[PDB]
Each structure stands twice: as structure tokens, then as C-alpha cells.
Amino acid sequence: MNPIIFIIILLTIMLGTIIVMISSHWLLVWIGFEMNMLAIIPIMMKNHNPRATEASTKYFLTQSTASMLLMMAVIINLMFSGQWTVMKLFNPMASMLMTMALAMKLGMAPFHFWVPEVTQGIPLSSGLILLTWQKLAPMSVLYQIFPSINLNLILTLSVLSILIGGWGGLNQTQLRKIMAYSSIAHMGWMTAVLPYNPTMTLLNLIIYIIMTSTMFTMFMANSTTTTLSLSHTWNKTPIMTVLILATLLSMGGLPPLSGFMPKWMIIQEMTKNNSIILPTFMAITALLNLYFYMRLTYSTTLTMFPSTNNMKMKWQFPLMKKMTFLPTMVVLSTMMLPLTPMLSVLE
Amino acid sequence: VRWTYARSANIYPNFRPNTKTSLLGALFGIGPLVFWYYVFKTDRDRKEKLIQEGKLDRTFNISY
Amino acid sequence: MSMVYMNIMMAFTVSLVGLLMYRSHLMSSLLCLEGMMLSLFVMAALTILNSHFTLASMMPIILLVFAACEAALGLSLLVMVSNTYGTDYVQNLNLLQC
Amino acid sequence: KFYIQEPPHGSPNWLKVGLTLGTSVFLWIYLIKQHNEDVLEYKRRNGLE
Amino acid sequence: MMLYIVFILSVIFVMGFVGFSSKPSPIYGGLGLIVSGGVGCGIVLNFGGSFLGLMVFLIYLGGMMVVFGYTTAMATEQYPEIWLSNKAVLGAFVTGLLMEFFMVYYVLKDKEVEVVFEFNGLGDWVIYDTGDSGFFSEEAMGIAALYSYGTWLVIVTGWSLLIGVVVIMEITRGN
Amino acid sequence: ARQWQPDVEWAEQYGGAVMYPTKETAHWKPPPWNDVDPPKDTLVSNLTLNFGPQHPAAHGVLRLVMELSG
Amino acid sequence: LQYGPLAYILGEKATKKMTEKSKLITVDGNICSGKSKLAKEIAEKLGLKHFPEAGIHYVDSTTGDGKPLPVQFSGNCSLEKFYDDPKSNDGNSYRLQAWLYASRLLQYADALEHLLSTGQGVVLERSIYSDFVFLEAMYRQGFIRKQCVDHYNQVKKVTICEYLPPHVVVYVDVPVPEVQSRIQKKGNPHEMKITSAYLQDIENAYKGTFLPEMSEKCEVLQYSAWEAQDAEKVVEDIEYLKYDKGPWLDQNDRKLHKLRMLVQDKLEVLNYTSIPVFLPEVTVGAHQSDQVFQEFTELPGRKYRAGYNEDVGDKWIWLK
Amino acid sequence: MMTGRQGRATFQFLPDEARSLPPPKLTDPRLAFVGFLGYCSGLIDNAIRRRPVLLAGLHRQLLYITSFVFVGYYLLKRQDYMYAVRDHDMFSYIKSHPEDFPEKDKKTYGEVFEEFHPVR
Amino acid sequence: LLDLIWLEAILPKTISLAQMKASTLVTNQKGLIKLYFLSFLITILISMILFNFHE
Numbered sequence A: 001m002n003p004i005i006f007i008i009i010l011l012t013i014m015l016g017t018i019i020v021m022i023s024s025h026w027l028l029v030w031i032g033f034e035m036n037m038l039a040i041i042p043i044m045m046k047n048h049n050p051r052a053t054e055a056s057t058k059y060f061l062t063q064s065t066a067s068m069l070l071m072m073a074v075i076i077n078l079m080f081s082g083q084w085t086v087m088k089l090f091n092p093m094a095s096m097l098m099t100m101a102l103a104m105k106l107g108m109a110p111f112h113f114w115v116p117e118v119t120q121g122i123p124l125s126s127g128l129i130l131l132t133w134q135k136l137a138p139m140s141v142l143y144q145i146f147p148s149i150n151l152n153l154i155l156t157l158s159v160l161s162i163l164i165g166g167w168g169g170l171n172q173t174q175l176r177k178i179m180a181y182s183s184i185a186h187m188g189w190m191t192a193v194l195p196y197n198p199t200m201t202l203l204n205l206i207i208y209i210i211m212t213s214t215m216f217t218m219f220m221a222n223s224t225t226t227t228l229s230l231s232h233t234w235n236k237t238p239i240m241t242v243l244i245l246a247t248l249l250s251m252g253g254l255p256p257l258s259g260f261m262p263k264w265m266i267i268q269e270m271t272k273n274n275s276i277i278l279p280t281f282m283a284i285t286a287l288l289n290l291y292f293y294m295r296l297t298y299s300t301t302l303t304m305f306p307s308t309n310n311m312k313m314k315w316q317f318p319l320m321k322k323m324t325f326l327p328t329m330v331v332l333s334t335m336m337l338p339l340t341p342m343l344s345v346l347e
Numbered sequence B: 001v002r003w004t005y006a007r008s009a010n011i012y013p014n015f016r017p018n019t020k021t022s023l024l025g026a027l028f029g030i031g032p033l034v035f036w037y038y039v040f041k042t043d044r045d046r047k048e049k050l051i052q053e054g055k056l057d058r059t060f061n062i063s064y
Numbered sequence C: 001m002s003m004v005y006m007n008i009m010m011a012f013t014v015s016l017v018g019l020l021m022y023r024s025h026l027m028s029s030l031l032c033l034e035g036m037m038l039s040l041f042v043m044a045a046l047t048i049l050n051s052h053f054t055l056a057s058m059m060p061i062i063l064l065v066f067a068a069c070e071a072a073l074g075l076s077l078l079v080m081v082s083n084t085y086g087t088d089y090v091q092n093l094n095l096l097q098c
Numbered sequence D: 001k002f003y004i005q006e007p008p009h010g011s012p013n014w015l016k017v018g019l020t021l022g023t024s025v026f027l028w029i030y031l032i033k034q035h036n037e038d039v040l041e042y043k044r045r046n047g048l049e
Numbered sequence E: 001m002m003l004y005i006v007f008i009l010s011v012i013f014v015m016g017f018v019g020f021s022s023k024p025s026p027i028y029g030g031l032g033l034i035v036s037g038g039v040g041c042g043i044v045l046n047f048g049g050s051f052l053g054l055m056v057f058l059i060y061l062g063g064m065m066v067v068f069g070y071t072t073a074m075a076t077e078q079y080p081e082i083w084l085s086n087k088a089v090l091g092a093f094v095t096g097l098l099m100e101f102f103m104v105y106y107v108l109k110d111k112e113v114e115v116v117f118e119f120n121g122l123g124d125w126v127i128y129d130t131g132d133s134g135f136f137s138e139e140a141m142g143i144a145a146l147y148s149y150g151t152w153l154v155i156v157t158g159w160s161l162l163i164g165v166v167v168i169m170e171i172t173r174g175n
Numbered sequence F: 001a002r003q004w005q006p007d008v009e010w011a012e013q014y015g016g017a018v019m020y021p022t023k024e025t026a027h028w029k030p031p032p033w034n035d036v037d038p039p040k041d042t043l044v045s046n047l048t049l050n051f052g053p054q055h056p057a058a059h060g061v062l063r064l065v066m067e068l069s070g
Numbered sequence G: 001l002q003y004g005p006l007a008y009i010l011g012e013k014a015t016k017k018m019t020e021k022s023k024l025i026t027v028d029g030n031i032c033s034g035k036s037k038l039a040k041e042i043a044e045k046l047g048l049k050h051f052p053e054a055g056i057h058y059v060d061s062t063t064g065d066g067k068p069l070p071v072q073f074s075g076n077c078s079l080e081k082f083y084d085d086p087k088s089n090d091g092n093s094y095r096l097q098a099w100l101y102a103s104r105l106l107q108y109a110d111a112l113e114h115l116l117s118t119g120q121g122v123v124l125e126r127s128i129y130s131d132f133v134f135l136e137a138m139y140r141q142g143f144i145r146k147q148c149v150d151h152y153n154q155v156k157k158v159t160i161c162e163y164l165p166p167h168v169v170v171y172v173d174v175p176v177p178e179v180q181s182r183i184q185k186k187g188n189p190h191e192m193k194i195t196s197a198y199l200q201d202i203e204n205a206y207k208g209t210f211l212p213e214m215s216e217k218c219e220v221l222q223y224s225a226w227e228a229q230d231a232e233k234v235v236e237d238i239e240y241l242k243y244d245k246g247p248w249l250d251q252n253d254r255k256l257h258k259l260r261m262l263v264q265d266k267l268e269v270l271n272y273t274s275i276p277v278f279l280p281e282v283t284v285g286a287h288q289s290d291q292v293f294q295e296f297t298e299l300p301g302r303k304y305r306a307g308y309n310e311d312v313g314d315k316w317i318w319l320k
Numbered sequence H: 001m002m003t004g005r006q007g008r009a010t011f012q013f014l015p016d017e018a019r020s021l022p023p024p025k026l027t028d029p030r031l032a033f034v035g036f037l038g039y040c041s042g043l044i045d046n047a048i049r050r051r052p053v054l055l056a057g058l059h060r061q062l063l064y065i066t067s068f069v070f071v072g073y074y075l076l077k078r079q080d081y082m083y084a085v086r087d088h089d090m091f092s093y094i095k096s097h098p099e100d101f102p103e104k105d106k107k108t109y110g111e112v113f114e115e116f117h118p119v120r
Numbered sequence I: 001l002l003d004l005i006w007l008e009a010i011l012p013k014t015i016s017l018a019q020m021k022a023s024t025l026v027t028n029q030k031g032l033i034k035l036y037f038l039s040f041l042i043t044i045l046i047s048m049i050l051f052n053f054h055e
């Protein structure tokens, strides 16, 4: 792509999301999703290969179906309330349709199948946009309609997402597929707490984005997309293996790292509402994710896998990728737990 | 090396749950626990019953 | 509700089932997607016109414009798929299985 | 001269160095100024001496 | 029977949908959608949406569907399988018309049916407005207001269409 | 002795398509190193046209075997 | 300004720098074919930059102080040991070929970066495009296993697809008996052990595979040993080529910006030369590679990024 | 829960009523920790780019510390404002609904009966 | 009998074995658009008929 056109397309992806986030009108929310989908397809197609074309097609079909269901919910809401204001919906059928539409857009289980495939089929930079920025608009909508959401439906989607994400990631060797299932699992935490305290949905979203952004950036720095290609990092950039280790432990939710904070604060809110079984089940099931994060740390940082002779040639050249914000992101991904009370700025 | 390996690491791979292993494990594993539970639970219930009725001698029993 | 809504809502349901139950041609599924938009356009227009919601009269046009633009994007992807494989069959789009 | 090819970071980028140090000074001066006025306004509103 | 023109049209509307939703060869799928679109415009006209109805013909049928048929010819179909000559296509078509027939049967007989929502079968005319004597078309006034009230809508809609041109050129270049 | 570190046999456990092979994933293979699959399906874009004159009133006896590209 | 998208937007576009003289020329031929002598002659007459053939230590010559590094930092690849013992069970034969392919791949990216950044043409002696003739010759003599050939083809497949071929391929044709005579004259004890079977397989690969393939996309010029002596005629022929085939005609500023972004980043160039395919010839255990890597960083000017090494006289490090 | 506060000046980082609160002290231990995180980010930046970790680019390290401390100061001001608002809302509600928060008539342990469970 | 066998079988070994089996069920998919969207239809139908999420 012409670099100027690439900038305009990224700004349009952001504009679509911003429109969703500032709109008080359901039509403008729908337009924001349409604009966002239109602008993201080129960045998925940009490397021109059959896998990128398949991923773009699978993504287009999923998102277009979701957006039609969203519009159906809006129109039903208009028929039963005569207004367009972005707020609680006034019909239970409209609520179910919009909740399902947003679950499809988020890739929540059982609407999840596209996330692993689409992420695998596109470049790492595109996957970073797909798994971080693309969650902002659907979450911002769920944040505003949650009082009218069916409690059983949203909690069912959350439980399934945590289960499927945890189990799906166990069988993966591709880094992009691991991040896709990790995203699905982390999605379930955000929606599980939404009925009780939407502020903790925002907290988990922000910290998830920071950690996911850190992981993709480090994968991009060495152009690694598989477990075995990442296992060579120790013999090229040792510092990167330590940073990868810290972030993976943080994503695993281990104290005293930053990733424990969202799990800690969500458990607190659910227990205040006499929800004991569900947070206990969620916390235990999250051990699945810790397992396949720990497997990566074993092959990357805590042991030394075999290298190749041609790796010696790489020693003579410096890293020249930008790695934008990486030093800041990795610190925020790991060392923020002592500042947990700062979550009140999200209130 | 073969001897120490056979006495540890090689055991579980060659284990099969069947009638012999299941029964012995239940008999040696759970058996003693159930037995000792009923010995102490019985003894303590009897002793507790006597203390509530003042029928157990604890005249100089002040260390516990 | 009035009787007409029953049929418009059936049409959306029918085209949604048609969208979710693929055969082979990717083109046949895109038509079901456009069918969904047509039924939304009609139901929106009927609700807005009957209620005399004057400023909402422009909403069906915006719906049609944005949905046609999204249909152009869908057709472009179909052409790129047909270039890769020579057909628009969805069973050739299974590389990402692994 | 040791390097066969001149490194991109052979010598300081004196423009960046100047803009880096100036930015730090600006933020520090601005932060101190902000803090002093917040303390003054906090005292005025609470009628404190 | 002319007093149920809207309902009769909506029955044809559903039948056309069952047409292309059973997904025969794309060539005939486009035909079902074209007929449904034309019937759809007819329903909108009978509610006082003359401009909206004609937009369907001009933009949906004369624009979008022409391009679909154009693309189908080049990239998809050149000759079709006979309509309803396939087991699944015919079974889906029969199933749809049976469901439509029964919905129509009960709504007309009991004057009311109930599936997700409650529907009344008195006739769509009963809900119409009984006061009309302005010297203009309310629909046209609302659409004309796009340029006065809807500045923000024009900007984002205009931006999306421009980005559509850019994006589609990117997608189809192939390198 | 020296600390054990993974050998090729250990490392190859993580190089398959999946972590836990099954009968239903036996045919699965790792994707291309650079994500590019070879274009082997259909690429036949050159028309061959036996060309004559629109009206045979003047030429009549011209046969032109042309190969076109768009 | 370091080249990048912003420099491109500010007018740094390859079509400005390049002219009809901005050509990439490779000279090929068998061992002792005189290709090197001609290549220097072509480069001088046409005013092109000459690149001596990439050997084992080509990468050393572009980094650090430019001097060759000890052999253990090339994996102990030895051309001499390939001639003394081509079937050694230590894997030297394929380990050498894999290292040389990466060296040529690096040199080719260096040639493109020079051509695209400055607009001046370049002359290479062999390239990544003809490197495979040596692989076929090794394989047919039984010096390497068929698994080694598969590894080479896997690496070549995902690396060569990213580059443009040369504008001109100059082949110097010398029969094997004459090549064998010329090797004896040159008086290299290890090179004298080359067999005619090995030299013949190189020739067969050049003529059966290389030249037919490059003819479809490059301007191929062939010369006998005697004709190649007249560089004036060779240069004359190059100047009157039409240049009407090949992917270079389908290039614009946008596509050359993407190419330049690649060839400038040498780690992105070499990314796939170290794919995790565990072939014994090229696989190094962690203990060895850990040991050698630590010794590499202990070399002068190697501990830190270039320009941050006090031990070689870098200054102002606290402000860089 | 506090999204629709009656006195919520919407989409304002620090509404004007926040100016009645004492500012965070520049010696606040949380602000010192934020500065430390900035210093760690500076060291990591050197490490990933293979510069001498402690000495390289002291100007860059200083801007890491300043920017973290600068942003940290305002985030703490908002943090303290949001907890002040929470307490203000809580106490106002308790006053407005005395029937829901009655002062208990609370007895001494001499009067309240607690069962004894012997440990024997 | 106890330490190396049954105390492994009743907890870590069996729990680990079940997760592995569940993982292969989740990830043994054919990558077919047709089947994935067919499962969406089942999800929507179940959500209404069985769980009445639309109410």
C-alpha cells in the first residue's frame, strides 16, 4: 500500500470505532460498525495470498451477518419504543438479537470459530488490530445496554468463552492461533462481570489490550509466528525472552503481576453479589490458559532449544523494527499491581 | 541406572487399572483411613460423653 | 402488530436461515445477505412512514447506501476468491483449518 | 575509525537531544506550576491559612 | 380484495424470499431477489413512501442488483441447473411455502397469530392515519432535511463511500 | 554432569500441526513458512478467437486466429 | 533521514534516482571460467559497482570493522575441507552450501539497496539464482543427502520470491576439460582434487536448468572463453539490449518502496534462512550455540549496537 | 454505578469541584513508584536496542521518568477525586434515608449470650 | 501402589487426560464456512426454544 493510503485506512478504522463510542443514535452506531468493517478488510488483504483472502472472506461474512442482526434489533426497538436513543432496549427480542450480534462481533463462543482462523490468516500487525482495537466498539455498546441484557444469556456466553478459549489453546503450536484462543478466554471475563459492575469490564479490557499489544509487538520484533521459531529467540535477543516470560506470566494472572488485577477485581464484584460458584469455576478454568502460556515460556525462556548454524549470521545485525511503545507497554503489563486503586479513574 | 529407573519412572506407564490394582489400592489406600476414622471418632465420642456428665476424672488436668 | 409485519419478519427470518445454511456458491449466500437488507429496508420504511416520524424518513436511504457499499466489498472478495480457485465455492476456503 | 560503515548512531542527533531535554524541562516546570496553583486554590476554597 | 393489497404483496414478498433463500443457481437467485425487491417497493408505495419506493427500483434494482448479475455472469454462473431440480433446493422451497401457507391460513381464519410477537389479522388498513391535508409530501420533507438537519450524517456517509472506492481498488489490485 | 537442555527429539514435539495428534488431524500439515500457498488452481486468461469480418461483403476470405488478453 | 515511509512521502522515490543505466548484472559460469575477470571489466567500463563473489566471510566484510571473523563464527564452514573430504560425516558439505546461500542472499539485498538508493547499477558474480547449481552437483556426487536438498529448496522457495531477478545474465561457457586444465594452472592444492564428474554436473545444471529459466525473465548473453576476453564487445552488447521482458517492467515507485524497505533490513532478509527444520548438518545444540554466542559478544565492537562501543572509541554514549 | 451522578460534568477529566480537594503531594509514595516505573521503562528501552543499559541516552531516560511522573500526577488527582465523590454520595444517601441506617442499641459482652465451644 | 500409581491416577493424571481430550474436540474443526454458520443457526434456535433467551 501507498503509505499515505495506509494511514488514511487506519484512521478510518479508528473513526468507525470513535463514531460508535460518541453516538447517541442507533443508526450512527450501526454506521460506525459499517465504516470500521470496510476499512479493516484492506489491512487483512494487504499481503495478497490465498490464506489472507480466505480470512478476509470469513471475516466479512461473520461481521456482515452480525451487522444485519444488529440492525434488526434496532428496528424492533424502534417499533416498540418509537425512538433511536442508544440506551437500554425496550423489547426482549431486540435485546437477544443485539447481544448475539455483539457476541458474534467479539468472537465469543459459540460464535468463536472465525477468530482462530482469521487471526492465523493475516499478518501479525493486522492480528494486533483485530484482537485489540476491534473489541472497543462492541464493548462500548455492551457497556450501555447491559441493564436490558438477559442475565442467563450473557453469563452463558461468558462461561462457554472461558471454556472454549482455554481448551482451544491447549492444542496450538501457531502463535497467532494461541493469541486468538487467549482472546476468546479473556473475552469471557469481561462479559461475566458486565451485569454486576461494568467498570470492571473496562478495567479488564484495558489491561488485556496492553498485554496483548505487548505480545504481538514482541512477536513482530523477531518475525515469529510459530512456537518453534520463537524458540530461537534466546540465541538472538536474550532480553526479549525475559520480557516474553514476564508478560506470559502476567497474562496467566499470576501475582504479583498486572494480569492478576482484573481477575482479582472481577472475583470481588461477583462475590459481593453472592455469586460464589461462578467466579470459582472461572478462576479454576483459567488455569487452562496458564498452562499453554507456561508451555510457551518453557520453549522460549526457561530452556534452550536447538539452534541452527545460519543463526550466527543474524548476530551481526541489529534489530531495526520500530517496536513502538514496547518498553512502556511491558512495564505496564507487569508492574502495575501496586497501583490497583487507580481503577477508580474508570468510574 | 536401569534398576533405579525401573523402580520409579517406568512404573506408571506400565500400570493398568484392573481388578487387582483397583482392589489393592482401595484396600490399602482407603481401608486404613476408614478404620482409623472409626477408632478415633468412637473413642472421642465416648470420652466427650463422659466429660459432659462429669464422669471422667480430670482432677489435675490443666495442660492440653 | 399489524398483519404486514408478520410477512416482513418472516422474510427476514427466511433470508437469515438462507444465509446461515450455505450450499456451494458464495454468490448464493451474498444474495441472502442482500435479501436481509431488503427486508430491513421495508420494515424500517413501514414503521417510519406509518408513524409520521418525519426526520426518520432519511434513515432507509442511509441503510440502503451503506448496505450496497458493503455488498460491493463482498462482491470484490468473491471475485478475488474466484481468481484464486476459478470458482466461488466455499469448500475451497478451508486452508485456515490448519 | 573502527566501523567499516558509518553507524546510524555514530554521533548524537543533536536535534532530538535538544528536543528531548527541553520537553523534560517543560513538563517539570509545568507540573510544578500546576501543583502550586492547585494548592493555592485548595487553600482558598477551604478558607485555610 | 384490493383492500388487502399490502398483505397480498407481502405474501408474494415472502414467496420470492423463499425463492432465493433455497439458493438455486445464482442466476435464478438474482431473479427471486429482483422480484422481491419490486414487490418490496410496492409495499412501501402503499404506505405513502413514493420516493423511498422509487429508490429501491433505482438504486437496489437498477444499481446493486445489476452489479450482482454482472458479477454472477463473469465470476460464478454461465448456465444454470434447472430450478427446483435439486433435492435440497426443492425440499427447502417446499418447506418455505408450507410455513408461509400456514401462517397465512391461521392469520386469516383466527384474525390473529402469535409467533414471538402477536400479529393481528384485521387488515393493514386499520392502522392508517385519518388526518391528511398538507400541501406537501411529509416523506419528501424528511428526506430533504438530510442537508439541513443531517450535516453529520452526510459527512460520515460521504466519507464511507469515498473509502469504499479506495478500499476496493486496494483489494482488487492483487499486489 | 551438564544441565540437560532440549534436543531435536524434544523440540520436534512442538513442530507439528497440533500438540495432540489424532486420527482426524493426521492429514494436517504445518502452514507455509511465509503464509503463501502456491497458485496452482486456475490461471487461464488468454482467449483464442477465430476472427472473421463482421460483414463478408468485402473481405469474406480472411481467417484470423488471434490470442487476446482482455 | 533514514529511509522509510516518511522519506518516501517526502519525495524519496526510486524512479527519480534510476535511469537506463541502473541495471543489475550477474556474471555466471563454471569454476575457473574467468567470470571474475570479466565482471570487474564490465563494471569499470559501464561505471557500475562491482561486488566480488560472496564467500564464507562476506557478511564479516559488511559489518563491524569489515575484517573476517574467526571460523567458529561461521560454524567452521570450510571450502578447503569440502575439497579434502566432501563426504565427511560432520555435515560440512551442506553446512557450507547453506551458509553460502545466505551469504549470497545478503549480498543480493545489498546490491538491490545500492541500486534502489543511489540509482547506480551493480555487477555480481553468481547470485541466489544460480547458487543451486552447486547444490545439484553436490547431490549427484553423493556429497549431500536428499534431505539436505529438500531443506535448501524450502529456504530458497520463501526467500527468492521476494526479489527481482537481474536485468542481464552473462554466462561464460568453458568446457570441462579446459576448466580442469585451468584449475591445475592455478595451483590450489585443495581445488586440484575436484573431479570432472563434479564439474560436469555444474555445467549440466547451468545449461539444463539455469539458463533456460533465466531466459524467460532476463536478457541472457553467452560467451566462450575466447569471446569473454573482449570485454569491449561484451559491454557493447549489454548497451544495445532492449530490456523488454521480466518483472522489472511491472515496477513502480510504490512497489520499489516495499522492496527497499525489505533489502535495507538485513534481519528481515535473513529471516527464513534459519527456519526450525532440524537437519543434522545445520542444527547446533544449545550448549555449543550458547558458548559461541557469548564469545561473539566478547569481540571488539560487538557487545553493543554499532556506535555504542566504548572499547572501539565511541563517544557521547550518554547522549545517544 | 456512578455513571449518572447528579453532579457529573460529563466527559471531563477533572471537574471543577475537584479543585476543593488537596492535591497529591509531589512526595506521594504512589507518585514515586510511578517515576520508578518510568525509570524501568528507560532501562528496558536501552536493553532491547543493545545500548549500555545504565549509561546510554540519559536524555531519553529522563524523558521516560518525567512523562510517567507527569501523567501519574493527574491520574492520582482523578483517583482521589473519584473516591471523594464516592464517599460524598454515600454519606448524603445515609442522611437522606435515616430509616434505613438506624443507630443500633448495642450491648456489652456481659449482657449478650455467646455459646461456649470447648476445645478438648 | 499408592504414591506412584493411584495418587497419580485419581487426580493429576485423570484431570490432565480429560483436558487433552476436550481440547481435541474443540480444535478438530474442518475450517468450512458452511459448518460454522450451520452451528450458528443451532445456537440461535436453542437460545429461543430451549432457554427462552428471547424473553
Ligand SMILES: CCCCCCCCCCCCCCCCCC(=O)OC[C@H](COP(=O)(O)OCCN)OC(=O)CCCCCCCCCCCCCCCCC
Binding pocket: D021, H026, H031, H032, H033, H035, H036, H039, H054, H055, H058, H059, H061, H062, H065, H069
Ligand atoms: C545532564 C544531561 C542530561 C540528562 C540528565 C538526566 C539524568 C537523569 C536520568 C536518569 C539517569 C540516572 C543516573 C544514571 C547514572 C549512570 C552512570 C553509569 O552508567 O556509570 C556506571 C556506575 C559505576 O559503575 P562502574 O563502577 O563504572 O562499573 C561497575 C561494573 N559492574 O554505576 C552507577 O553508579 C549507576 C547508579 C545507578 C543509576 C542511578 C539510579 C537512579 C534511580 C532513579 C529512580 C527513579 C525514581 C523517580 C521518582 C521521582 C518521583 C518525583
Ligand SMILES: Nc1nc2c(ncn2[C@@H]2O[C@H](COP(=O)(O)OP(=O)(O)OP(=O)(O)O)[C@@H](O)[C@H]2O)c(=O)[nH]1
Binding pocket: G029, G030, G031, G032, G033, G034, G035, G036, G037, G053, G079, G082, G096, G097, G100, G131, G134, G191
Ligand atoms: N561447494 C561450493 N563451492 C563454491 C561455491 N561458489 C564458489 N565455490 C567455490 O569457490 C571457489 C572459487 O569460485 P570460482 O569463482 O568459481 O573459481 P575462480 O577461480 O575464481 O574462476 P573465475 O573467477 O571465473 O575466474 C571454487 O573452488 C568453487 O568451488 C558454492 O556455491 N558451493
Ligand SMILES: [Mg+2]
Binding pocket: G035, G036, G053
Ligand atoms: Mg572467481
